[PDB]
């Protein structure tokens with residue numbers, strides 16, 4: 001998937017985690033988000049199209065995906081332990097990550 | 107790229123880091139490992155091909171890549187602070203994560 | 213030190229980081245927050261004093277400090293690389309973790 | 319507890335996690351290790367007794383406790399999900415952390 005496709009996947013599944021009425025729905029959405037974040041690792045965003053992939057600026061870009069991927073990891077452990085309220089509380093943590101990368105690079 | 111190709115990138119760069127003398131050599135190798143681990147995320151390995159995509163086995167397979175990505179994240183911070191020997195030692199911690207996933211799924 | 217004293221150190225240093233101009237101010241504040249979070253680890257908060265020490269509530273109380281310590285770890289790496297604005301933004305992510313634990317246990 | 323007391327606690331509970339015949343024994347030992355690691359945060363080791371607590375060398379010392387505390391966090395999520403074999407596999411990850419700090423600072 002390109003960056004825009006992975007972003008729609010993150011957006012749809014974040015909404016699911018906000019509306020989830022059960023653990024299985026949250027677990028399924030977090031697994032799709034993990035796959036979209038991992039796949040977005042390789043992308044060059046438009047604002048950085050004229051920087052080499054080995055540049056410090058691209059390092060600072062990708063750093064936000066480490067944070068998101070880390071937060072999804074924890075949210076899935078919380079969802080697996082039956083903590084349905086907590087797992088959703090993930091949504092507040094993920095949103096801050098979404099916003100920081102968008103503010104710097106979108 | 108395919109799972110065996112990402113494993114060759116992980117193996118080759120782990121050896122670059124062992125034999126490295128400076129932070130720029132360690133940084134470049136870890137950047138390539140981060141990209142290979144991220145790219146291997148959605149791979150299905152041969153020994154799990156007849157399992158459900160949401161089998162506990164496929165969950166546990168992907169959990170290994172969360173561990174590896176987390177460790178590469180920390181090693182690149184140490185390399186970025188010019189801590190060459192610490193970054194090299196951190197890359198040595200990766201081997202436990204290599205071995206745990208191989209023991210179960212290779 | 214006691215839990216309220218560590219909370220005053222976290223609150224005061226979070227504000228130092230917001231108003232900071234340079235990396236040394238951000239580094240010193242985050243070092244104090246790391247020590248306060250670590251010291252608060254084994255505290256029992258007033259609203260959980262009649263629960264088992266291994267109640268899910270006390271497990272969930274300590275999980276919050278794991279999240280906070282992880283975030284302070286990453287913020288100090290960014291401050292150590294001289295990324296003043298990123299470190300300050302990272303300190304802003306702490307507020308979600310502040311709020312989640314307060315919502316349940318303060 | 320002083321550093322030596324927290325270290326005996328880490329050592330006794332690591333052995334428990336190596337010998338555990340059930341999840342509850344592993345969970346109890348990981349909780350004691352988390353408390354000992356958090357409490358060891360504030361300590362100055364003998365080899366660094368003549369460095370100020372705000373020094374870079376003490377920062378590099380404490381960094382090893384972030385790694386250990388992070389690894390215990392994950393081991394407890396794995397133990398909680400009923401993964402008794404995996405949870406123990408933690409013991410291999412923790413040992414590497416033990417050894418790195420000891421090699422540099424003991």
Ligand code: HEC
Nearest residue numbers: 007010011014045061064065068094097098101102105106
């Ligand atoms: C960087 C590390 C990012 C993180 C983390 C997240 N997003 Fe993102 N997103 C990013 C970029 C560079 C772009 C622009 C891509 C382009 O080619 O233009 C986006 C775009 C979106 C969009 C599209 C809407 C738009 O206004 O362009 C959406 C809906 C979106 N991103 C959602 C999203 C969510 C929900 C995230 C976290 C859960 C998230 N993104 C993280 C860069 C980054």
Ligand code: HEC
Nearest residue numbers: 110113116117120151167170171174200203204207211212
């Ligand atoms: C799972 C989560 C894994 C982690 C972490 C690592 N590896 Fe791996 N590796 C894994 C599998 C399932 C396989 C078999 C792939 C197949 O289709 O047969 C491998 C294989 C390798 C190989 C052999 C490659 C080949 O023959 O073409 C190597 C050299 C290898 N892995 C190295 C490696 C290193 C160095 C790792 C950590 C740094 C590592 N792997 C992690 C699964 C997983």
Ligand code: HEC
Nearest residue numbers: 216219222223226257273276277280306309310313317318
């Ligand atoms: C639980 C895991 C917590 C996290 C993370 C944070 N705080 Fe906290 N805080 C917590 C409790 C249980 C309490 C009540 C303590 C009591 O005995 O009443 C508090 C209290 C505070 C306060 C009030 C202190 C006082 O009145 O003396 C402040 C100002 C405060 N907390 C700030 C704070 C900040 C800034 C945090 C993140 C950076 C934060 N807390 C995290 C539990 C937890």
Ligand code: HEC
Nearest residue numbers: 325328329332363379382383386412415416419420423424
């Ligand atoms: C630094 C970040 C450390 C980590 C992580 C761990 N240990 Fe440690 N340990 C450390 C120091 C500086 C010392 C010496 C303290 C002193 O005053 O002399 C120790 C000591 C021990 C000992 C005592 C035996 C000895 O040879 O001195 C033991 C048994 C021990 N440590 C065990 C231990 C284990 C099991 C750890 C991980 C699970 C571990 N330590 C981590 C510094 C650090």
Ligand SMILES: [Cl-]
Nearest residue numbers: 064067097100
């Ligand atoms: Cl972020």
Ligand SMILES: [Cl-]
Nearest residue numbers: 170173203206
């Ligand atoms: Cl592993």
Ligand SMILES: [Cl-]
Nearest residue numbers: 276279309312
């Ligand atoms: Cl939290």
Ligand SMILES: [Cl-]
Nearest residue numbers: 382385415418
């Ligand atoms: Cl370590």
Ligand SMILES: [Zn+2]
Nearest residue numbers: 001002039040
């Ligand atoms: Zn793609």
Ligand SMILES: [Zn+2]
Nearest residue numbers: 008009011012
């Ligand atoms: Zn959609």
Ligand SMILES: [Zn+2]
Nearest residue numbers: 074077275391
């Ligand atoms: Zn957790």
Ligand SMILES: [Zn+2]
Nearest residue numbers: 180183285381
């Ligand atoms: Zn680190």
Ligand SMILES: [Zn+2]
Nearest residue numbers: 195196415418
């Ligand atoms: Zn190490």
Ligand SMILES: [Zn+2]
Nearest residue numbers: 202203206407
């Ligand atoms: Zn492992």
Ligand SMILES: [Zn+2]
Nearest residue numbers: 063179286289
């Ligand atoms: Zn980081």
Ligand SMILES: [Zn+2]
Nearest residue numbers: 097100301302
């Ligand atoms: Zn951020």
